[PDB]
Amino acid sequence: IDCHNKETEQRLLQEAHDLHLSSLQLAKKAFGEFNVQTAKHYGNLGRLYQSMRKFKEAEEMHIKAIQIKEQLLGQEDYEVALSVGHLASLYNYDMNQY
């Protein structure tokens, strides 16, 4: 995001996408769908999709992250707060769901 060349922007975004997808698959195979680590992977994917201008499924990623974080860590927890903060930053800045 802090770069200026658009080709470099897209290439590093896709590299981060590949790294997050590989990490998500490893975590999902190891632990399972309902875990904090998989939820962190989902939140990383959501914020990356926000950074990749794909805001339609960024909301889906963030809500999938929060519904797993708040189910295990309760409605009030640090990871839950960070994930809902990412979702709010997605809503108010780019998806115009003020």
Binding site: N44, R47, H86
Partner: peptide, 9 residues
């Protein structure tokens, strides 16, 4: 700085 920091490592 649009977003917050990463969840964890």
């Amino acid at each position: 700085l649009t977003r917050n920091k990463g969840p964890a490592a």
